[PDB]
Specification:
heterotrimer; A: 135 residues; Immunoglobulin-like; 9-stranded mixed sheet; 0% helix; B: 201 residues; 2 domains; 5-stranded mixed sheet; immunoglobulin domain (chain B); disulfide bond (chain B); protein folding chaperone (chain B); Chaperone protein caf1M (chain B); Periplasmic_pilus_chap (chain B)
């Protein structure tokens, strides 16, 4: 055999916290690789969800019990360097609907910012599920 | 009017794995004037900073290599050194010039040690003896306390060395106080989770 | 058909050590006729910043070439070597008297956690155990030992 969606991840460079306790935007947090889907699967057939459930954004949380959070967006690039926007928690950027690369597709997790307070240094995780429709 | 100074190190501690070739740390001149960056290692020269002295133009960043060449360190415990990074600016009326010496912990960690500090942070035990709050640290890591409270009052913190103790001076009003709270600083420089415990006899 | 997969994505955030310092000159100083300067003359104001909350008053040390514990020493730029001492002191959240280390010792107070964000210290004239003052200079290193 049956079709199997795969989802791997490669972590990018460590993120430096600024003196205001926030982080820069557009930092490569890391790279998701989605594979194992049918030919002709479009970006709107792909939905990354997490527990926070914020439409369009993934939320990372600190591992220290202090609930420090930051958000990120998920954006791939096609061959001519236009944005590929998959659904994140049900939602999408308008205009970034695109057929996925054959076999597998990389998506960049790009930093937005702190969500509710100064950030503390440490480890941050987010448990992501991907649903791919029309398989 | 007022003059301004500032040195930034890319991290607030350096975890150095025993026997590693070296590590790099970013140094930034956050000022609108060039400085000389002068870097030195102090005990609590096996470690070598390169370059020991170099010029850094306004708003620029460069990196230092910290490298171990020799030295003999316990393998049952962490060792502590200080990396100091000094920004030297250019050269009755009172004229003073300042220079910031920004100092961070260089923690020497044997690969022989299992785990990390935040996994043993909860194991601190606490005691009042001779009017002083005494912490015991049974782990092989420096317990770098970043927040400490006793009977609801804030105590200036200090590291607890590995397999050892530290005594803290207490402000009056903590007669029959029993409840200690603490956070350590994790390896990335952040305030970790809150632990809470009663003092023992 | 909807097919699913999952992964726990991760990131490391790092806190750099930033130390800043502002010096604000106080009024110019008046000799009084006997060759004295007045006491408690606010020579200048230091604002120490950038540090992480929890940084304490004993993690901060102002040193100068004289190395006189607890006092900073200003010397004339002439040839004649006239000197005076100052102290570095501030206030906590209870308006109690606090000092950082100066050449390795505190003048006044218990160790305290410094104020959040930034902390003011005032450089205050002591006297001149010599006597007869006639540009006076100092070169001061502010060492901050981060937690």
């Amino acid at each position: 055999e049956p079709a199997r969606i795969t989802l791997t991840y490669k972590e990018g460079a460590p993120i430096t916290i600024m003196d205001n306790g926030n982080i820069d935007t557009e930092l490569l947090v890391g790279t998701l690789t989605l594979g194992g889907y049918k030919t002709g699967t479009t970006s709107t057939s792909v939905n990354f969800t997490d527990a926070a459930g914020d439409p369009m954004y993934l939320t990372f949380t600190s591992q220290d019990g202090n609930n420090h959070q930051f958000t990120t967006k998920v954006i791939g690039k096609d061959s001519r360097d236009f944005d590929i926007s998959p659904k994140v928690n049900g939602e999408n950027l308008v205009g970034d609907d695109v057929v996925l690369a054959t076999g597998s597709q990389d998506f960049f997790v790009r930093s937005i910012g702190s969500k509710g307070g100064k950030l503390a240094a440490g480890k941050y995780t987010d448990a992501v599920t991907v649903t791919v429709s029309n398989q | 009017a007022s003059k301004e100074y500032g040195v930034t190190i890319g991290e607030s501690r350096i975890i150095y794995p025993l026997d590693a070739a070296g590590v790099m740390v970013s140094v930034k001149n956050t000022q609108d004037y060039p400085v000389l960056i002068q870097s030195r290692i102090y005990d609590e020269d096996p470690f070598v900073v390169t370059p020991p002295l170099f010029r850094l133009d306004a708003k620029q960043q460069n990196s230092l290599r910290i490298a171990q060449a020799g030295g003999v360190f316990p393998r049952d415990k962490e060792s502590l050194k200080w990396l100091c990074v000094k920004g030297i600016p250019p050269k009755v009326g009172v004229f003073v010039q300042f220079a910031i010496n920004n100092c961070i912990k260089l923690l020497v960690r044997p690969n022989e040690l299992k785990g990390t500090p935040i996994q043993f942070a909860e194991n601190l035990s606490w005691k009042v003896d001779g009017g002083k709050l005494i912490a015991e640290n049974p782990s092989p890591f420096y317990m770098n306390i970043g927040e400490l409270t006793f009977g609801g009052k804030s105590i200036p913190s200090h590291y607890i060395p590995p397999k050892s103790t530290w005594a803290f001076d207490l402000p009056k009003g903590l007669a029959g106080a029993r409840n200690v709270s603490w956070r350590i600083i994790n390896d990335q420089g952040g305030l970790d989770r809150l632990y809470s415990k009663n003092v023992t006899l």
